[PDB]
Ligand binder design. Structure first.
Ligand SMILES: *[C@@H]1O[C@H](CO)[C@@H](O[C@@H]2O[C@H](CO)[C@@H](O)[C@H](O)[C@H]2NC(C)=O)[C@H](O)[C@H]1NC(C)=O
Ligand SMILES: [Ca+2]
Ligand SMILES: [Hg+2]
Length: 444
């Protein structure tokens, strides 16, 4: 079945090369030689049922001293493999290879040349161990629907990916193009920030969340926290950009070092103003995937401008004020920084997340594995913000077991350069991608 498969060099497409039997230790009929000109190669024709990730090994004889080789997957970029000795036939690890459902090619092209190739062995990459996900939320007093949401997420983890979108009107536009609706909708508490309210900002974020909760959906809430003070309010740096380090002189380290000041008083004014909106959601029975202090490690937001320690301390202020003081039990705490120095701690983080903005609709494998290492597989990993919706074929192949994905709004989801309607349909109509339809009755 799904195991090591050797492909003998003799039984392949030879371009300016020949089959030989002089050297000792080969497998099969013989081996391939005649690596003079640059155009000389071995084109192996391999096929797969689905799109999988295989490990590559080359069986070579470097009798003309140590040489270098070019490996080509489906007429793509070269990959130099070094052959160190050699007196006999031995094997080298040539990294990983992603094969697409159907016909594929693995060429061994003359680089330095003057070597003998016996065979190539493709082994399907190691299946990931079952995730050791924590069964319960950090808050012991967690309400019914938060406890339900966490269990449902825990049950689907590694099996499927929950589709998600930033803003309800964008979730409706997806239904207009794919006939499917994101299971998860993310809303921003941004226009609830007193600093912004003071300048006339209104928000329907609580209205949109409850609407989607009534449609049987999952709700994610982030907060673009506009600093209470320090607003430059310049033509270049307007008050409405007040969440940016660039737009405020607001020093969180100073503010936390002086807890009896006015700066710290206004900070709690802001947390309590937002707590009014969350309590309003709690009373409405809406479980929330609460994601405050997002992209902290980046430092482009005032809450991560003074480095990791003030950021972590603020996370714990929010956790004490919202969980203990305001007594909010509908919140599932989602951390949004990859770095260990920035990680607050396992006792205040329920689910780990990342914001990845790279074109191509890839599995964002590297970021997923970084968080696997961070939460040591005890916490679920989510793609809290993506620019490009991930393809389920690649998510599965690279075993990038993201719990959910949430494509950002304007200039991303509706931007053909990031997401085409074609790719959207492909993703939204997959048996791997859970839509609104498919998640119905999760609260039962
Ligand atoms: C309260 O916060 C404000 C905003 O960060 C602080 O005011 C700024 O202070 C710096 C010096 O530390 C000045 O360069 C700015 O011009 C001030 N801005 C304004 C609009 O006044 C204020 O100092 C903080 N209070 C404390 C005790 O640190
Ligand atoms: Ca052979
Ligand atoms: Hg609106």
């Amino acid at each position: 079945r799904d195991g090591p498969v050797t492909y003998e060099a003799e039984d392949a497409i030879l371009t300016g090369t020949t089959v030989d039997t002089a050297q000792v230790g080969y497998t099969g009929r013989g081996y391939v030689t005649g690596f003079d000109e640059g155009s000389d190669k071995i084109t192996f024709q391999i096929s797969s049922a689905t799109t999988k990730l295989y490990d590559l090994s080359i069986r070579y004889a470097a009798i003309y001293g140590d040489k270098r080789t070019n490996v080509v997957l489906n007429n793509g970029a070269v990959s130099e493999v070094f052959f160190p000795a050699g007196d006999s036939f031995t094997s080298v690890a040539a990294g990983q290879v992603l094969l697409n459902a159907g016909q594929n090619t693995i060429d061994i092209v003359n680089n330095w040349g003057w070597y003998l190739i016996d065979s190539i062995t493709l082994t399907p990459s190691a299946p990931r161990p079952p995730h050791d996900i924590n069964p319960n939320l950090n808050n012991p007093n967690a309400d019914t629907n938060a406890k339900k949401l966490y269990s449902y997420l825990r049950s689907v983890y590694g099996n499927k990916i929950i589709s998600g979108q930033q803003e309800l009107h964008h979730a409706e536009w997806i239904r207009q193009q794919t006939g499917k609706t994101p299971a998860l909708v993310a809303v921003d508490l941004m226009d609830y920030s007193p600093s912004r309210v003071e300048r006339g900002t209104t928000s329907h974020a609580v209205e949109d969340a409850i609407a989607h909760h009534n449609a049987g959906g999952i709700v994610s809430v982030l907060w673009h926290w506009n600093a209470p003070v320090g607003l430059y309010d310049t033509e270049e740096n307007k008050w409405w950009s007040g969440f940016y380090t660039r737009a405020t002189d607001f020093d969180i380290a100073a503010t936390l070092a002086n807890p009896q000041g006015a700066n710290y008083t206004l900070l709690i004014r802001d947390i309590d103003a937002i707590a009014v909106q969350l309590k309003r959601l709690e009373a409405a029975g809406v479980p929330v995937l609460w994601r405050p202090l997002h992209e902290a490690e980046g430092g482009w937001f005032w809450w991560g401008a003074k480095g990791p320690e003030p950021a972590k301390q603020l996370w714990d202020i929010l956790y004490e004020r919202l969980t203990v003081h305001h007594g909010l039990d509908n919140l599932i705490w989602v951390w949004n920084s990859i770095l260990e120095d920035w990680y607050p701690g396992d006792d205040t983080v329920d689910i780990l997340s990342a914001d990845v903005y790279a074109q191509g609709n890839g599995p964002m494998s590297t970021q997923y594995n970084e968080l696997i290492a961070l939460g040591r597989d005890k916490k679920m990993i989510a793609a809290a913000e993506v620019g490009a919706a991930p393809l389920p074929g690649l998510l599965q192949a690279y075993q990038a077991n993201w719990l959910w994905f949430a494509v950002w709004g304007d200039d991303f989801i509706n931007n053909p350069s990031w997401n085409t309607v074609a790719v959207l349909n492909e993703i939204y109509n997959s048996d791997y991608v859970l839509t609104l339809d498919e998640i119905q009755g999760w609260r039962s």
